[PDB]
């Protein structure tokens, strides 16, 4: 099964014309992140059939030289945002390795769908493109991954992400849920979460190769 077929079925079932017109006009008249050419990068680097793990984010980073179409990732030569710092701290405490780059393209290639629920945002405006239609799309993606794949790990950080358990068949799929790695929430249960070993233990339990979380 290919993204092409899944995107086709999703775009039959819902009219995205109004969204594509709006987004056309937005890129014309505003700074919109990430660059047009990266909106779907999470899909390009992680074909449907290579999905081992789904990590949900909210909306892309809204500062320059930050978002590139992956959840949590930023550009290689960009400041490490706090949530990533805490992801990297736990990863060192959990797996052992210390990541020197804040780019998560290697994760995506390993089989981690780094899917933001909302795939665009206006500069400096958190949630600016919430409910222009991106959640309709993303929800169908999450539903598709659950319906057609056999045994996938969904990692759900914070309650907004955890609302998507509705779309997951929790009898087929592994659910790793915890408080957000944001510095507001991290010390109240994200440290010692061990989402990375837990994911790999589950993948080996169903005959899938571990994800190499390190570089």
């Amino acid at each position: 099964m290919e993204w092409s077929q899944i995107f086709h079925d999703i775009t039959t079932k819902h009219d995205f014309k109004a969204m594509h017109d709006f987004l056309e006009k937005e890129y014309s008249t505003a700074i919109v992140y990430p660059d047009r050419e990266n909106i779907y990068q999470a899909f390009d680097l992680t074909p449907f059939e290579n999905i081992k793990v789904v990590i949900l984010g909210q909306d892309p980073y809204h500062g320059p030289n930050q978002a590139h179409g992956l959840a949590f990732s930023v550009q290689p030569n960009a400041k490490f945002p706090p949530s990533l710092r805490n992801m990297y701290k736990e990863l060192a405490d959990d797996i052992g390795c210390v990541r020197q780059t804040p780019h998560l393209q290697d994760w995506a290639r390993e089989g981690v769908l780094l899917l933001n629920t909302v795939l665009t945002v206006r500069q400096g405006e958190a949630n600016s493109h919430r409910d222009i239609g991106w959640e309709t799309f993303t929800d169908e993606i999450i539903k598709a991954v659950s319906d057609y794949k056999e045994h996938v790990v969904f990692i759900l950080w914070g309650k907004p992400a955890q609302q998507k358990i509705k779309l997951i068949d929790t009898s087929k799929h592994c659910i790793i849920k915890s408080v957000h790695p944001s510095p507001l929430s991290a010390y109240r249960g994200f440290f010692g979460s061990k989402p990375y070993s837990k994911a790999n233990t589950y993948l080996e339990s169903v005959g899938k190769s571990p994800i190499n979380w390190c570089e």
Partner: protein, 86 residues
């Protein structure tokens, strides 16, 4: 209103250059479990790490107005309030 406004607001209250890197939406239950108070409405937590190693968090209301609500610095076991509406 946008991140410039929140950067200026938070820069005034700390008297050094603040640039917020990320904005994460939290539910009221989530704000409660972390700071002790349960708001009536979703908050967005705009966060940054500074050169001196300090972690600054501005909680605001939702889009479109991102009205401040609390400003916090991270301590060993908890937080330090640097601004509050209450």
């Amino acid at each position: 209103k946008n991140i410039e406004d929140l950067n200026k607001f938070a820069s005034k209250i700390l008297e050094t250059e603040i640039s917020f890197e990320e904005s994460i939406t939290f539910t009221p239950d989530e704000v409660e479990e972390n700071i002790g108070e349960k708001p009536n409405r979703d908050k967005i937590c705009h966060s940054t790490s500074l050169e001196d190693g300090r972690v600054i968090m501005l909680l605001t209301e939702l889009e479109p107005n991102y009205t401040p609500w609390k400003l916090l610095e991270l301590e060993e076991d908890g937080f330090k309030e640097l601004y509050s509406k209450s």
